[PDB]
Design a protein around this nucleic acid. Structure first.
Lengths: 51, 124, 170, 134, 50, 51
RNA sequence: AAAACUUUCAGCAACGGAUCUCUUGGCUCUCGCAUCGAUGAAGAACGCAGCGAAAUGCGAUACGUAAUGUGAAUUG
RNA sequence: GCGAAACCACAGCCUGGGGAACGGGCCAGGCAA
RNA sequence: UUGAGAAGCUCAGACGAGUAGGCAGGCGUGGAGGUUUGUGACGAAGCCUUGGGCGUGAGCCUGGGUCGAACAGCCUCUAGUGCAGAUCUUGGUGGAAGUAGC
RNA sequence: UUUCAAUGGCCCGUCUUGAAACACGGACCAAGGAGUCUAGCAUCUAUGCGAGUGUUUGGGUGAUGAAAACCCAUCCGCGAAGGUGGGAACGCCCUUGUGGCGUGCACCAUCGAAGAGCAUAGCUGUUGGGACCCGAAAGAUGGUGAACCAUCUAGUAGCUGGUUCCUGCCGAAGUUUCCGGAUAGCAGAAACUCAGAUCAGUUUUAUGUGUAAAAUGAGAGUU
RNA sequence: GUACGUGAAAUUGCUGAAAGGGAAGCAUUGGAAAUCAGUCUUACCUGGGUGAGAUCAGUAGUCUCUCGAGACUAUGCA
């Protein structure tokens, strides 16, 4: 999986800075719309009150 | 490919005429000894997949256009390239203010508006 | 704005080419015929010449007043009356253009349409009559020679009681 | 009958999309067989242990050469055997213990996409399956 | 060729929009003064009393 | 990080904020659509090179 | 065959109070706290307002007094 | 003048045959004002 | 040739009763997270109407009249979610009937 | 849309009955109104991990609801305790094709003696729990003046009546057989192996009506 | 308009309409009366003249980007 090694840090003024960070390994992990749905589906029922 | 329909009349519910508690919405009669469900003569018809219309003509108005519901003036813009097949239906709750914005924009765009004369009034 | 905006599926090459029409044998030029439909229905008219579909035909203006007109062969009864020489008249000038309906033309300025003050009249041109008067001058001499023919065209076709078109050939 | 996986692993609907094209555009039975097994349920795809794979390639006359073992399903390891042999393996999934053990001592692990770009016709590949009885 | 095909159609279809916008501006097309449900009712009742 | 295939498998099928569910066809509200419909060849987000 | 009467459909007026919108109410869960009476409690009755129909409030110091505040309203 | 309750699928000429009652509807009939 | 929503587009042929029952795709209601940079005093929701349409259908979109403050399409979550019956519960209303009668 | 003209069409639901006949329930309209919530078990599928597996007893933590999210210590639960041929797939060919030579998975025959779970979610099934909804005299405790009241009580049902939107596909059995049942059969649903293989509410041929071996068709057989 | 938000169905009264020999009822096919659906040559192409503008100048500047790609400000209209 090859993609975009470095990201650029923006200062307060909005101008780019010469420093850069390697794109973290997490940013290549699988993207799963079904698995996020069936986990958000569950995790969102966890702040419920009983009636 | 012209707009031809296998049937005009709607399917009414059986015995929906006699009663008023019985709605005219088609309900399948599940009666065990129901002769009207049994397809006897002098009875009513019943929805079948055999009554479907041409797949290149389904959803098509009698003038050949398919109705497309535009809420705001953004929606009327995307019918730029399908004006020969779709007609900009204006939603029922769109106010008379934006209703003119939708009709004037659609007139120049070249698309056909179906309810362009509602709640408004012309002035010369 | 010429590059086809939509898909616009084009008509496939249809394998139909126009061929000459074939008319009935009795429809040969110079045949008395019973006009069936139109404002001049019921008259009797001779066939000057054939056309693509119709028959360019006219009755004697000095007898019946039927002008040269395209009449479809289907709306014409082919009568077995003795044939009349029609070779004399010049039939070549009779074309589709001659019988063409005047083009929807003659634009008017957008003030005269209001108040209805531009209405012209398409009243029949004289040469159209002069064409027919020549045709009469070439068919009226022909027809009087045949006895009762001139009166036969004058008379109006009709059916009495107990008339069976199939039984009595026209 | 089975012509659409019951799965919703979005990447398995991309793997099938690759082997639907390969199956119908090549004359090999490896592709037609691979595509079928990408439709099978999780129950019908048993885990196949590393030791079972190690025995199959190094079976009888051995002569493993450099054939690639291919299995649709996981490849769980076998700590009960110490010395793993050199192996080229293609599978849907590995286990982090197994994949390290293949990588550390010997060849390499592959996913079904890296096998396809190497042997689209199933060229010199052993297609194995785990014990179904379970 | 598919991608260049769709851009040419849009350029065709956008030009016809710009043309139609021009001709409509030239013609003295009628305004569309809308209708109010409150003023229509109030004038309807005030009339009947008159 | 940039794949026309995974991006489409999310937007095309799970949820894209521009799709309008029509009766026969889906229309795309995205301003950069050359066709105005929701397709795979048309959609501006999946196709990495677009005009 | 018209009227009368009977029948269907439409207009209009009654009748009825569904629907829609809400809502100083209900229910549910969590959270904090420890406080009745022989020094007469809970409960009940009778009273009491510049006038109260219920309703609250109050006890012959009666829709409360003292005291501390707020600072000009009660309101049919 | 003051005024119910019961009841209510809907109706209501028969003649016969209509096989399972069929007459309260079906077909042959007459009647039908 | 543009026809990659590959869950798409396209081609060919046969076929079509249905109870018990099995399988599949959908329509609709209340509310929930996301969304339409959604609609709404220039009129939301509702309601009626022989207005016009859409769907085989469940249903839907719209015109007019009333109306006056909210509401919806889409992807998922969720349930006190769909009625013609139950001598069903509650309310309303008729014929009977200006009758029995007082 | 109303109406007319010609052709037509026995009241719906339930129950009964092969079927009806029936007997029921229905004066009309609106609203309310009946497989639900939960623990256990098994199955199918989906997901995460995989000889492992499971954070939520609890602790750590969470400044923008802090009953969420996020993190892991000590246990614990559930798992863990060889040849022969037929074979999927592949390579080598080589008269190529045909096939052979092989390597032979799952598994099956044979001779024989290289773990696949755990957890979550769903579906259908089953057992309990008030258990789809409605309906049987109760009985008991304790009170009030044989009677009456209140609760336990969601006491008890094989039975009665009812159980709510659309379309599409498949669609029986209606009964053998042993014996209220286990079988079977029909219908499905899955997994397999083959069309160069078997078949048939089939027909012939012929040997002695049965049996065995030609046509006519259909791919057939298993778990 | 205090029988007071919206005001549905059943149900009743008035009016207009058609229909009305012991039913009605609905379905097909039309007809008739009554009523709505929707109307559109107009644009395209070509020819010239006339004034223009600019994405054009055998042209001059600024702004943001990445030479030239945009947004403009002059100036001339070839």
């Amino acid at each position: 999986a090859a993609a975009r090694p470095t990201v650029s840090i923006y200062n307060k003024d909005g101008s780019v800075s010469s420093e850069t960070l390697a794109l973290p390994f997490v940013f290549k992990a699988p993207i799963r719309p079904d698995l996020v749905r069936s986990v958000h589906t569950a995790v969102a029922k966890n702040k419920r009150q009983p009636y | 490919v012209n707009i031809i329909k296998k049937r005009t009349k709607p399917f009414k519910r059986h015995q929906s005429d006699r009663f008023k508690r019985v709605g005219e919405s088609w309900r399948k009669p599940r009666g065990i000894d129901s002769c009207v469900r049994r397809r006897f003569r002098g009875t009513i018809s019943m929805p079948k997949i055999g009554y479907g219309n041409n797949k290149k003509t389904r959803y098509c108005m009698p003038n050949g256009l398919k109705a497309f519901l535009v809420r705001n003036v953004s929606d009327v813009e995307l019918l730029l390239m399908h004006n020969k097949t779709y007609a900009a239906e204006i939603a029922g709750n769109v106010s008379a203010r934006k209703r003119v914005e939708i009709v004037e924009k659609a007139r120049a765009l070249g698309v056909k508006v179906t309810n362009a004369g509602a709640k408004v009034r012309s002035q010369e | 704005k010429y590059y086809p905006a939509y898909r616009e599926n084009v008509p496939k090459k249809a394998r139909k080419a126009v061929r000459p029409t074939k008319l009935r044998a009795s429809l040969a030029p110079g045949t008395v015929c019973i006009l069936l439909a139109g404002r001049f229905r019921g008259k009797r008219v001779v066939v000057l010449s054939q056309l693509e579909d119709t028959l360019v035909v006219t009755g004697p203006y000095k007898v019946n007043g039927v002008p040269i007109r395209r009449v479809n062969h289907r709306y014409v009864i082919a009568t077995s009356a003795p044939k009349i020489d029609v070779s004399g008249v010049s039939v070549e000038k009779f074309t589709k253009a001659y019988f063409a309906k005047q083009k929807r033309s003659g634009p008017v300025k957008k003030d005269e349409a209001f108040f209805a003050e531009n209405a012209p009249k398409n009243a029949l041109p004289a040469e159209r009559i002069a064409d027919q008067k020549a045709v009469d001058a070439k068919l009226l001499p022909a027809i009087k020679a045949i006895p009762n023919m001139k009166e036969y065209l004058a008379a109006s076709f009709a059916l009495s009681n107990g008339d069976r078109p199939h039984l009595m050939k026209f | 009958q089975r012509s659409k996986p019951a799965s919703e692993n979005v990447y398995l609907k991309l793997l099938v999309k690759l082997y639907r094209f390969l199956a119908r555009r090549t004359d090999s039975r490896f592709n037609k067989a691979i595509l079928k097994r990408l439709f099978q349920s999780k129950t019908n795809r048993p885990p196949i242990s590393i030791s079972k794979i190690a025995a199959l390639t190094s079976r009888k006359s051995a002569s493993s050469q450099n054939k690639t073992t291919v299995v649709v399903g996981t490849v769980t390891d076998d700590e009960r055997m110490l010395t793993v042999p050199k192996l080229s393996i293609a599978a849907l999934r590995f286990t982090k213990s197994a994949r390290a053990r293949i990588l550390k001592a010997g060849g390499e692990v592959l996913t079904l996409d890296q096998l396809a770009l190497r042997a689209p016709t199933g060229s010199n590949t052993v297609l194995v399956r785990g014990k179904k009885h379970a | 060729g598919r991608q260049i095909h769709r851009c040419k159609q849009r350029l065709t279809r956008l030009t016809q929009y710009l043309l139609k916008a021009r001709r409509l501006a030239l013609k003295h097309q009628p305004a569309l003064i809308p209708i109010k449900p409150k003023q229509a009712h109030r004038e309807a009742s005030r009339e009947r009393k008159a | 990080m940039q794949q026309d295939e995974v991006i489409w498998q999310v937007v095309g099928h799970e949820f894209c904020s521009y799709r309008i569910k029509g009766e026969a066809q889906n229309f795309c509200r995205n301003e950069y659509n050359v066709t105005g419909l929701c397709n795979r060849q048309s959609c501006p987000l999946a196709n990495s090179r677009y005009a």
